[PDB]
Design a protein around this ligand. Structure first.
Ligand SMILES: Nc1ncnc2c1ncn2[C@@H]1O[C@H](COP(=O)(O)OP(=O)(O)NP(=O)(O)O)[C@@H](O)[C@H]1O
Length: 88
DNA sequence: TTTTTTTTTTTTTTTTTTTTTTTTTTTTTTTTTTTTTTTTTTTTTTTTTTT
């Protein structure tokens, strides 16, 4: 199979629920500086698992959107992909 | 004009100092080990809350 698309919620400067579009065979993630694009990869490394120290943030509580600034939004987060393999 | 006297420059000798080079010794930062402590994370029971 391959990596179809993912799903974000409140994790690291992505407020609300929005669906990352379907991925073609070979895509790219462009954007100007400081826009916050590395954090999608951070999300990918968090669904598939990576020790927290490698996630360039201490304590795992400033993960929620807006916490490193000083004001959280909720007490949840939800990141999720949808793997699509042969067999329908 | 020639002879006699003075002074400056050039060059060699020497002596003291400086530099160099190696060698041997020493003592120091560097590198590795072990420990071990902290802190973050985890769990599980307790507590709180909801139907
Ligand atoms: N949970 C959060 N909520 C809101 N903002 C955040 C959060 N975490 C980090 N940020 C900020 O949002 C930005 C995201 O940083 P980061 O994801 O590293 O961006 P980037 O993708 O590396 N930028 P760039 O390479 O220049 O395109 C930075 O300014 C962070 O300080």
């Amino acid at each position: 199979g391959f990596l179809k698309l993912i799903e974000i919620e409140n994790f690291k400067s992505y407020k609300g629920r929005q669906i990352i579009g379907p991925f073609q065979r070979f895509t790219a993630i462009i954007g100007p500086n400081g826009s916050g694009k590395s954090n999608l990869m951070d999300a990918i490394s968090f669904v598939l698992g990576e020790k927290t120290s490698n996630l360039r943030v201490k304590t795992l509580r400033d993960l929620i959107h807006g916490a490193p600034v000083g004001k959280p939004a909720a007490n949840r987060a939800f990141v999720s992909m949808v793997y699509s393999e042969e067999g329908a």
